[PDB]
Design a protein around this ligand. Structure first.
Ligand SMILES: NC(=O)C1=CN([C@@H]2O[C@H](COP(=O)(O)OP(=O)(O)OC[C@H]3O[C@@H](n4cnc5c(N)ncnc54)[C@H](OP(=O)(O)O)[C@@H]3O)[C@@H](O)[C@H]2O)C=CC1
Ligand SMILES: CCc1nc(N)nc(N)c1C#C[C@@H](C)c1cc(OC)cc(-c2ccncc2)c1
Length: 157
């Protein structure tokens, strides 16, 4: 299974100056629950913005840099290498990897952040004409999660 995992706003903003524009604990839990025990594939800039692998799953980084070798991270150098990865693989960002992979994935786990933020990186445009809504669940608002948000699971038709 090859999936996209992404959070984007009403205009498909995903990032700003190598950071997420929002702070949403419910979304991090969501990500943990989905990917624990599986594989995350991410671009080099995305990895460096956090700088540490996420524990309890395989962390894979795509980069042209043949000197890359981080403790607890696996490296690949070609998009083609993604297909050799075993198990459930989640394309985890950022913009460049999303653009490269959106036409190739089976399904998408999207957190729609119902706001308009300033961004410099975007999720590519897509149409529901090509994607069936397997599920759509509103996030609960509270003290620490104060932006409305919706978890979508979309499956390519
Ligand atoms: N809201 C969300 O769900 C998410 C948001 N983000 C955000 O996205 C932004 C970063 O996106 P972006 O700038 O596009 O960077 P990326 O994370 O997509 O990294 C780009 C780098 O990945 C490597 N790479 C990509 N494709 C290839 C390839 N085909 N072959 C070899 N290497 C490749 C290259 O590394 P190299 O230059 O070393 O060769 C390239 O420079 C940040 O703001 C981040 O916060 C990221 C993930 C999720
Ligand atoms: C969650 C934000 C998020 N939400 C959703 N729905 N999809 C995503 N793909 C991401 C994401 C992401 C990237 C920036 C990312 C990569 C990473 O590579 C290790 C670690 C984290 C991370 C480690 C720990 N705490 C917060 C974030 C985030």
């Amino acid at each position: 299974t090859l999936s996209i995992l992404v959070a984007h706003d009403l205009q498909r903003v995903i990032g700003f100056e190598n950071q997420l524009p929002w702070h949403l604990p419910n979304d991090l839990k969501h990500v943990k629950k989905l990917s624990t025990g599986h594989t995350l594939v991410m671009g080099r800039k995305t990895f460096e913005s956090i700088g540490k692998p996420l524990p309890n799953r395989r962390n894979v980084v795509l980069t042209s840099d043949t000197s890359f070798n981080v403790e607890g991270v696996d490296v690949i150098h070609s998009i083609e290498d993604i297909y050799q990865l075993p198990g459930h693989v989640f394309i985890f960002g950022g913009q460049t990897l999303f653009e490269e992979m959106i036409d190739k994935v089976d399904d998408m786990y999207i957190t729609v952040i119902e706001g308009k933020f300033r961004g410099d990186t975007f999720f590519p445009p897509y149409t529901f004409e090509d994607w069936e809504v397997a599920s759509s669940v509103e996030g609960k608002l509270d003290e620490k999660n104060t932006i409305p948000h919706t978890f979508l699971h979309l499956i390519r038709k």
